[PDB]
Symmetry: D2
Subunit: 247 residues, 4 copies
């Protein structure tokens, strides 16, 4: 129970990878405060799966791209729990299109949620962590941020951006004993991959030395490592969890 | 005359590194189309220095963060020169602050000029280069995009973003023979640099000195020429050994 | 105990970081097989510390640069314990000098122990792991393998080489479900660290964002992560444990 | 003529990429001193092609894995041309095999030539370059040194090692203004379907492409670049 009584904030906790991160942290003893934006019922369900592990949990609506929402979100976290030991910046979206026809709003929305939202949530949690002289920030990037991917210029830019932001953050907060790292998932069995056709899946599997999509638990286990004392001398790093796709 | 007959578009060409890029490309025979945003007098100085090399040059006012300005800019470039063979995305700004104190405006302005502007200009030039089945795009990043830097969350995010965008662009445009690369300057002597801050910066550079705008221009020229035709999706650090 | 019943081979396990890796893996329930050279005294101390955790342990004399020694070492590991679940390639030496002054034997000795030793041990364990359709290899590199270091051309080349070899190995063994990763330590405390001049310590700590040397437990914890189910979708990676020295 | 009056030493100059590096440097006005090991007839052909550009050229037998050969090679280079301005460490071999079947000799031969050879030549040229307070060293790596490649554990280890060595050399020699960099070729056409699929540009590169990257890193055009690896691989590794 390596996180017993820690307080973890998880953005995008209402479903997918974020829900499984919340549950995994709860399994290790962390109390959870997470957000949702468009899915209230999904948040109820995360909250019940988390509560089964005997920790305290609270959900709150917040759009991470909106500074006002992010400010109220962290204020309430601190009101409820007094501290934030772990922040997981997991909220993210895709709006895939060829660069040549990519719409300005497809660009803006992905940059604003994925990159700016991570900046906003980092900014809002920074003072509490600096006063605590302790904290872990885990940003959710993607291995395509490392290598590029046709049809995803906005997403790639946002995730490469997050990796750069992770480094600056790590440099700024390191003197107060705060670890800041990123996880870079490859292709994980999720709603994203559930929508794909056989030819597309086949070509994706061919890029993975292990020959299979990862699981949400693989990603949660990386976040857990980076949220715990087991990684206390690691900062400013991106951990790729991608079956060998990017070496 | 490595670029004789070529047309190069340079964003941020009115001063500094962009001015020296434009002059260097002109010295190799390229006609230059470049933008300015708030410095018409500087733009006219650049134009004169470019024209001295025997090529044609035009400057046009445009904000690279604004989609409508970018569309008009590239429209006018094609009306003036008939084609675009080289795009150098050099326009960029900084609005430094500790991340805990960084204002939403400081974040947005830097992301929109440095990163969105590079996207918009790349998008604008892409169909033209695809039709030509030839082209070079050189994006200006920074070594702080590679390693991070305290006080520059926005700038670092934008430049690391540019590096990723460079790679996606290279992938999308490679089937039509277009090269797409990035140059990552370290500490370069300019008006902006010329404290104890300087001595601490020098201690980070194995060569022991700031670089010159000509060093950066020379990297850009290499990546814009036939000498680098099998190079794509790469970032070239021009930093005196600061980041290895 | 997350490695209950596993067998770990740790090269260089008789002292320093190697010893602390062997002890950490023993505390998670792994039986330990390790090599030594010269006097058995350090090896005797390691075996004692390991056995206090209630697992089985055997030391064997073997020089990792020597093919014959390696062959016999792995044969005896199989004879003694049945299988090899984890291999930690930690054997390593330095012979520092500026390039101008570096002797040919100083070059060869370091390349042979650090790089060739990793190759020979990897080769020796590979058929066993392939047959098992399971296994973890963790190679010990160094952050100077990533960025270079004056006076260490041989050491740097060897550890950079080890990082490349890690990637080839991961590629060749991925189809049998074997994970292969590297750990890159930064500046880690030894019992001489405290004795250094203040000027010396300050110049080293200036290069580290976290502002302190790491511990051998920090390194052992990263190895443990990479030897466990928690990292089963991670392969071909180098994990830097360096307080942010290299980002 | 960017390199008029310069003296370039090229290892592995008798064939393939090294031959074209030598020619390209000559084209820019450099005198050329290069080695061969097993191919004197190919070395004569290289020398004739270099001599077309009006520069002086000499070939000399040397195994870069042998310290005595390397010392004599560099000694003769200095005797012949007075100085060395540029060193290109291009000699290299492959001896492929799956890790589990790879022989100790296949490992040793590739490490000794590709990595130890680059160390030995770098060591030999370093004193004269330091005394000059000028020089350029370009090492030949490979993109598989960056990402790994099944069947090539020896080659990959050797080239990844060269990249690390490049960084150390760059740091040790930067105080006297010597630039040290590496070129990492992808698939280059030398003397199919699956290789091409991995290259975004959709074609193998040419020896001229590699030669042009070497020339850039050997010239004043790159004087602020050191400790870098330039991948010339049609986008294979980004
Ligand atoms: N799936 C993969 O294979 C994969 C690969 C690489 C990286 N990743 C990264 O891992 C993270 C999670 O991915 P996923 O596949 O689990 O995505 P998902 O299933 O779509 O879940 C996304 C989560 O983010 C939240 N979210 C979206 N927009 C938001 C906004 N404006 N404000 C606040 N929250 C918002 C959603 O909340 P609501 O639904 O309540 O709005 C939801 O809980 C993402 O950052 C993604 O880029 C995933
Ligand atoms: N100096 C260095 O050491 C260094 C290091 C790393 C990276 N870089 C990068 O290299 C590039 C140029 O650097 P520099 O030092 O030469 O910069 P600089 O002298 O400050 O010039 C910046 C240029 O960007 C233009 N610009 C500003 N806002 C704009 C907008 N909204 N739309 C269009 N153009 C705009 C300016 O034109 P107006 O004056 O007309 O507005 C100006 O010509 C930048 O991308 C920079 O980030 C420089
Ligand atoms: N071709 C590619 O696609 C590719 C890809 C990645 C990297 N590279 C690298 O680029 C470099 C050139 O390769 P290449 O394809 O052009 O090979 P190559 O010329 O066909 O043959 C290797 C060259 O190295 C010399 N050589 C071999 N062993 C030697 C020794 N012990 N001492 C001295 N010289 C020796 C040979 O000389 P003799 O014939 O006289 O013995 C020959 O000139 C190599 O380092 C290679 O690893 C090439």
């Amino acid at each position: 129970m390596t996180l017993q009584g820690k307080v973890a904030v998880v953005t995008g906790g209402s479903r997918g990878i974020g829900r499984d991160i919340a549950i995994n942290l709860a399994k290790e003893g962390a109390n959870i405060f997470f957000n949702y934006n468009g899915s209230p019922e999904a948040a109820e369900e995360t909250a019940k799966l988390v509560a089964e592990h005997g920790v305290e949990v609270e959900a709150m609506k917040a759009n991470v791209a909106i500074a006002e929402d992010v400010d109220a979100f962290f204020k309430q976290a601190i009101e409820r729990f007094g501290r934030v030991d772990i922040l997981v910046n997991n909220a993210g979206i895709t709006r895939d299109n060829l660069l040549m026809r990519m719409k300005e709003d497809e660009w803006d929305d992905v940059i604003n949620i994925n990159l700016k939202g991570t900046f906003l949530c980092t900014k809002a949690v920074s003072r509490t962590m600096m006063k605590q002289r302790a904290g872990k920030i885990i940003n959710m990037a993607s291995v395509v941020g490392l290598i590029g991917n046709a049809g995803q210029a906005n997403y790639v830019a946002s995730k490469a951006g997050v990796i750069g932001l992770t480094k600056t953050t790590a440099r700024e907060l390191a003197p107060r004993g705060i670890n800041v790292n990123a996880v870079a998932p490859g292709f994980i069995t999720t709603d994203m991959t559930d929508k794909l056709d056989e030819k597309t899946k086949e070509a994706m599997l061919a890029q993975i030395p292990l020959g299979a999509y990862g699981t949400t638990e693989d990603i949660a286990n990386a976040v857990l490592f980076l949220a715990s004392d087991a990684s206390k001398y690691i900062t400013g790093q991106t951990l790729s969890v991608d079956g060998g796709m990017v070496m």
